[PDB]
Design a protein around this nucleic acid. Structure first.
Ligand SMILES: [Mg+2]
Length: 469
RNA sequence: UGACGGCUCUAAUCUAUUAGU
DNA sequence: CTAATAGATTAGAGCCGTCA
């Protein structure tokens, strides 16, 4: 017989200085942190896409209701929540004719057709940003569904074009990094989900009972990409810098090699949260070696410490390096010789590989979300997915898998590590959910690494997330 | 790519030992 | 260097479900 400890919910902060565990209820009752005046939208696409986008904007102005209110809270309309204006009147439209899309998607080569389509879509945006006077906050791209199915890694149709990955989204986001334009990509079937059907008279994707969830998610993404702040973490310890490292293989560049990208989070003076990336891949020619050479790791730590010191004035007292791999002595000894003496380096490995499952005896639901099984002083299991009493349901299906936390380097208290990891799961601005399954320091550093490796080398890429997600 | 979760098919790398070079 | 047996790790792709 073993013992399980339970970890309390972290709580997040909204307007008026109010707290709550659910983002939706906090946004509905108190509203966002900062105050935008309005969002001016630029749309690029066909006439069908423009009509669909205008219809969705008109649709999401009124209150929207879900089938089960307890599980998913209602959507009370955009302006009731966000206290700003985003209507179908600040739209500036740049038409893309259907002939171009038809004729470019004919070469039968994925690389050439993807490059041509991306260039066609981005040249108009570049021109409208350079040679025009109108102001656009977030650009909205509305791609037809018939090009989405063909621009994928493994896709077959039923000149510096080979240096890029054959995916529309990654290349599109990468090639606009040097102009710093926020963008949101939509599929025609995502907004006009009724009109696209199958052999039966039903939509392929049925949003009849989860329409409020889609409205919440789209509104939150559009409000974040316009330079807004919808919530923040209530309790973050001072003097603690959280880092996150992810390795992505740079496919098809003269050899099989792989890079590394990071993310960082801390609390700055003024009770603000600085959640921002750490960019510029650090490589190593070895194939399958998910590690860093000393020269490439000293630079990474120096960069992170310099950033924190520049924003704060003093070095961090504690630095936690979360990762999904295991460090070695060769690279960890590269650490600790650029780190000062008044700073604690803790390297924590997070994985979801070990197959443990817990079942309730004489019941029908799953285990709580706070439960943790402490194996040792350097090892534990934490359930980040499970039954949440507030929404009266679980965050997954079947029986969820635990997250295996293992203190790899340094010394730390495993309970505090679990508390910080659980608190790091409430900052998913790409989503409007109760909580996420893994820390976002490992997810946003993965999105940035996925975008950065689908283009040629670009000097000093932006750090802000709004240009990536 | 509006999110998230759960599965499946695949490919490397390392360590140990053996063997033709 | 090449070719097999294992254990213990890693990163990629692709498909399905979300309510009652
Ligand atoms: Mg997004």
């Amino acid at each position: 017989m073993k013992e399980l400890i339970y970890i309390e919910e972290p709580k997040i902060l909204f307007a008026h200085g109010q707290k709550c565990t659910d983002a939706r209820d906090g946004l509905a009752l108190f509203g966002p942190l900062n105050n935008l005046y309005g969002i001016k939208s630029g749309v690029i696409g066909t006439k069908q896409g423009l009509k669909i986008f205008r219809d969705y904007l008109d649709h999401i102005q009124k209150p929207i209701y879900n089938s089960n209110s307890i599980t998913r809270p209602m959507f009370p309309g955009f302006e009731a929540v966000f206290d700003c204006k985003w209507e179908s009147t600040g739209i500036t439209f740049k038409e893309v004719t259907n002939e171009d899309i038809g004729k470019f998607l004919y070469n039968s080569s994925t690389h050439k057709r993807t490059y041509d389509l991306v260039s066609l879509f981005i040249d108009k945006i570049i021109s409208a940003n350079k040679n025009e006077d109108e102001n656009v906050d977030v650009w909205f791209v509305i791609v037809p569904d018939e090009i989405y199915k063909y621009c994928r890694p493994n896709s077959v149709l039923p000149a510096e074009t080979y240096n890029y990955d054959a995916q529309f989204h990654d290349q599109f986001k990468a090639r606009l990094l040097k102009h710093t334009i926020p963008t949101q990509i939509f599929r025609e079937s995502t907004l006009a989900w009724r009109d696209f059907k199958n052999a039966f008279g039903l939509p392929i994707r049925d949003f009849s009972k989860i329409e409020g969830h889609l409205a919440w998610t789209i509104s939150t993404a559009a409000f974040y990409k316009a330079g807004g702040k919808p919530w923040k973490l209530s309790d973050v310890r001072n003097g603690v810098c959280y880092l996150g490292l992810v390795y992505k293989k740079v496919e098809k560049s003269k050899n099989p090699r792989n890079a590394c990208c990071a993310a960082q989070m801390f609390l700055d003076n003024g009770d603000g949260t600085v959640f921002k990336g750490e960019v510029g891949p650090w490589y190593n020619p070895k194939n399958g070696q998910y590690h860093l050479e000393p020269k490439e790791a000293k630079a990474l730590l120096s960069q992170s410490l310099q950033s924190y010191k520049e924003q704060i004035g003093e070095y961090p007292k504690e630095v936690f390096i979360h990762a999904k791999t295991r460090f070695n002595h060769q690279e960890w000894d590269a650490f600790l010789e650029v780190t000062p003496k008044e700073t604690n380096l803790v390297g924590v490995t997070i994985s979801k590989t070990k197959p443990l499952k817990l079942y309730k005896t004489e019941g029908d639901y799953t285990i709580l979300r706070g439960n943790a099984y402490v194996v040792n002083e350097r090892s534990a299991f934490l359930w980040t997915v499970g039954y949440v009493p507030k929404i009266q349901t679980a965050l997954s299906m079947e029986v969820p898998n635990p997250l295996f936390i293992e203190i790899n380097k340094g010394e730390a208290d495993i309970k505090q590590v679990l508390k910080d990891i659980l608190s790091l799961t409430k900052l998913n601005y790409n989503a409007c959910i109760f909580a996420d399954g893994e820390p976002v320091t490992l997810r946003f550093a993965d999105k940035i690494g996925e975008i950065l490796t689908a283009s040629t080398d670009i000097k000093t890429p932006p750090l802000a997330f709004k240009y990536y997600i």
